[PDB]
Amino acid sequence: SGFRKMAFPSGKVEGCMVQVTCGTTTLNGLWLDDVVYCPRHVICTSEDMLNPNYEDLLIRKSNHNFLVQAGNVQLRVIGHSMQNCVLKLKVDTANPKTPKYKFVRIQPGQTFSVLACYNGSPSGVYQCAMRPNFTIKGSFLNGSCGSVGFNIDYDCVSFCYMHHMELPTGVHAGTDLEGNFYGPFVDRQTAQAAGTDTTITVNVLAWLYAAVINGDRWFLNRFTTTLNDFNLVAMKYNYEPLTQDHVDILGPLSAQTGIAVLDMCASLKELLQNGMNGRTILGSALLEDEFTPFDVVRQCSGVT
Amino acid sequence: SGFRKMAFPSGKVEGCMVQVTCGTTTLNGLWLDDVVYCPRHVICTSEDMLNPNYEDLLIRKSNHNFLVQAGNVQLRVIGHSMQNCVLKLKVDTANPKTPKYKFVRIQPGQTFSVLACYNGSPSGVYQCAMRPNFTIKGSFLNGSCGSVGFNIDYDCVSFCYMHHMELPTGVHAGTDLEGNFYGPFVDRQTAQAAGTDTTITVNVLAWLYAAVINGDRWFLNRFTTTLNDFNLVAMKYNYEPLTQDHVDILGPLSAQTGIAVLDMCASLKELLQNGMNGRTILGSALLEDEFTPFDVVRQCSGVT
Numbered sequence: 136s137g138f139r140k141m142a143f144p145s146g147k148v149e150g151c152m153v154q155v156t157c158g159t160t161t162l163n164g165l166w167l168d169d170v171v172y173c174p175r176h177v178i179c180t181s182e183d184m185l186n187p188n189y190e191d192l193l194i195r196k197s198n199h200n201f202l203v204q205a206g207n208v209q210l211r212v213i214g215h216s217m218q219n220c221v222l223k224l225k226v227d228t229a230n231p232k233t234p235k236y237k238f239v240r241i242q243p244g245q246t247f248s249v250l251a252c253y254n255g256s257p258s259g260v261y262q263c264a265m266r267p268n269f270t271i272k273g274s275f276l277n278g279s280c281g282s283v284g285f286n287i288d289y290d291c292v293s294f295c296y297m298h299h300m301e302l303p304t305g306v307h308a309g310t311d312l313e314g315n316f317y318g319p320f321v322d323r324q325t326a327q328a329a330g331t332d333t334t335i336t337v338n339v340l341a342w343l344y345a346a347v348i349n350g351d352r353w354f355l356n357r358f359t360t361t362l363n364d365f366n367l368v369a370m371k372y373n374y375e376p377l378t379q380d381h382v383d384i385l386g387p388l389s390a391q392t393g394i395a396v397l398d399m400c401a402s403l404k405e406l407l408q409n410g411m412n413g414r415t416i417l418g419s420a421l422l423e424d425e426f427t428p429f430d431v432v433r434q435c436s437g438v439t
Numbered sequence: 440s441g442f443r444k445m446a447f448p449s450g451k452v453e454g455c456m457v458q459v460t461c462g463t464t465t466l467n468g469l470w471l472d473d474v475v476y477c478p479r480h481v482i483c484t485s486e487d488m489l490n491p492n493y494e495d496l497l498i499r500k501s502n503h504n505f506l507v508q509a510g511n512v513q514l515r516v517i518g519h520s521m522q523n524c525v526l527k528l529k530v531d532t533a534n535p536k537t538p539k540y541k542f543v544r545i546q547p548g549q550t551f552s553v554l555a556c557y558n559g560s561p562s563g564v565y566q567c568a569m570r571p572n573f574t575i576k577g578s579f580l581n582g583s584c585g586s587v588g589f590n591i592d593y594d595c596v597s598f599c600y601m602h603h604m605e606l607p608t609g610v611h612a613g614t615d616l617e618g619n620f621y622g623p624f625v626d627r628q629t630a631q632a633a634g635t636d637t638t639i640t641v642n643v644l645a646w647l648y649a650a651v652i653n654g655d656r657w658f659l660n661r662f663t664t665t666l667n668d669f670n671l672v673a674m675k676y677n678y679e680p681l682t683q684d685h686v687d688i689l690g691p692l693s694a695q696t697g698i699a700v701l702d703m704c705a706s707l708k709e710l711l712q713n714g715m716n717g718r719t720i721l722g723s724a725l726l727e728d729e730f731t732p733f734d735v736v737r738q739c740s741g742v743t
């Protein structure tokens with residue numbers, strides 16, 4: 136028992152991290168097979184970030200201008216190209232540590248682990264969720280760009296995020312591994328405000344199920360509700376509308392605990408309406424929304 | 440910016456995890472050089488755990504009874520011995536993935552990362568603190584025994600914890616890598632209750648400094664206090680007494696923010712006395728105590 140904000144083991148990703156330098160800018164890259172992926176803003180100075188013309192800036196760069204170092208060994212760059220907001224640097228050596236991998240574009244509400252890196256070296260790992268406004272609440276400092284988000288299915292690493300920027304709000308924006316930004320964000324130092332950060336209702340319910348499994352049951356009540364009634368309450372509290380798909384995904388958690396999904400919705404409704412009254416659930420004094428139903432089952436079963 | 444419960448990158452430890460089986464019991468082991476470390480209760484059945492005589496149980500075991508598998512390859516066991524509550528299995532092959540490492544016995548209040556494992560395979564990583572009552576609040580299921588806690592100083596892995604048991608309270612107990620339990624716990628399925636779980640005051644203050652660095656400053660007030668006055672309040676709230684050593688360790692955080700340690704103590708005093716009034720600090724609605732002052736500096740500087 137016990138429930139923690141657990142990240143995937145980061146070893147398979149640590150073996151892919153490299154340092155990429157272009158001119159005076161150094162950030163992280165992801166070396167998979169014979170390609171190194173990195174944010175295209177590596178070709179910019181801080182002066183360029185106000186209104187960069189990436190196609191024009193890239194014309195002034197040749198293969199030899201991209202310095203790629205894997206630990207202490209220099210990779211030879213034999214090609215470069217821009218795909219959306221990422222640069223793909225073809226190198227002459229396939230990464231011997233390349234794991235089985237996929238590039239996936241995740242949905243808002245889905246979770247992933249981030250291996251924060253600086254100068255191609257890993258500093259730490261933590262679990263994230265793609266917010267419904269397509270930002271992530273990470274922990275990134277200057278030089279962390281190119282750090283990636285991923286999930287792991289036994290031996291396969293699904294890369295879903297590459298860090299590009301911190302919004303003036305202190306929240307983070309980035310792309311999938313095809314270089315497409317999540318949300319409306321652009322790689323320009325401009326006024327970009329994130330939309331309403333709604334709470335991921337299906338994840339809060341999954342976390343309530345995790346709480347019941349792990350012994351925290353004080354919040355269970357004698358009530359039930361309907362999807363429409365629950366959603367009137369979810370709207371008032373800036374919670375995502377709950378759908379039948381969400382109820383279906385909570386099915387295994389419902390079956391394991393014997394608590395019908397709508398009954399858990401009624402517990403959640405009372406918690407929204409009455410607050411925690413100074414009490415805690417799984418060591419938290421707020422409703423946690425960064426565990427998916429899949430995460431709860433994975434953690435409560437012991438998948439390796 | 441942003442502040443997260445960050446774990447160390449787990450790659451160097453993932454390369455050490457193996458599966459150890461003795462009879463019908465399978466748990467995790469730690470392979471470093473030519474030795475595999477694991478909990479001695481691997482020699483027990485659940486029947487034995489009520490009152491085990493480990494020396495007597497071990498006499499019935501030979502080197503060939505300890506099955507050690509590293510991924511899919513079997514290690515040859517050429518020696519075995521019991522050191523306190525751990526077994527050390529001498530194998531004929533040095534682990535090629537052995538990192539630079541040390542065995543350290545940590546102090547209560549200190550933090551570490553845990554790589555939860557099952558059947559020698561890693562499932563996830565999370566950040567912990569050794570509680571002042573010498574328990575850890577982890578996420579462990581049956582088969583997780585032998586999973587280890589560690590810290591990393593650039594290339595050196597300091598192993599500090601090996602998981603042994605879950606107390607009837609849902610909290611966790613284990614040993615250092617010399618097999619000595621943290622706290623008064625014994626590897627016997629018996630009545631063992633943890634003492635008072637006090638809050639790690641120096642860590643809460645470190646986290647308040649992290650909050651100010653990252654922009655959450657609402658809790659700063661116009662007051663100051665003294666160590667003796669603060670400690671009268673800390674006692675009332677089951678917080679650890681703050682010492683001059685703790686103030687000294689907070690020195691760098693104080694210098695960086697310009698907020699004197701006793702002034703932060705006065706903010707903490709008001710937060711203890713008045714609560715958060717429905718507000719949050721670094722996304723938490725309670726006072727976080729599982730970041731040391733070293734953790735805050737490390738995360739806020741970008742150490743790899």
Ligand SMILES: CNc1ccc(N(Cc2ccsc2)C(=O)Cn2nnc3ccccc32)cc1
Nearest residue numbers: 176180181275276277299300301322323324440
């Ligand atoms: C020289 N090149 C350069 C490139 C990028 C940045 N910017 C601004 C920006 C605008 C549009 S895309 C990126 C970043 O946001 C970087 N970054 N990322 N995460 C960060 C956390 C803390 C501090 C900085 C961080 C700055 C300089």
Ligand SMILES: CNc1ccc(N(Cc2ccsc2)C(=O)Cn2nnc3ccccc32)cc1
Nearest residue numbers: 136480484485579580581603604605626627628
């Ligand atoms: C057959 N051998 C055996 C050995 C140990 C255990 N016990 C009881 C126990 C008493 C004294 S030392 C250990 C554990 O506590 C194992 N364990 N650890 N973390 C756990 C989380 C969830 C469930 C079980 C967990 C049980 C069986």
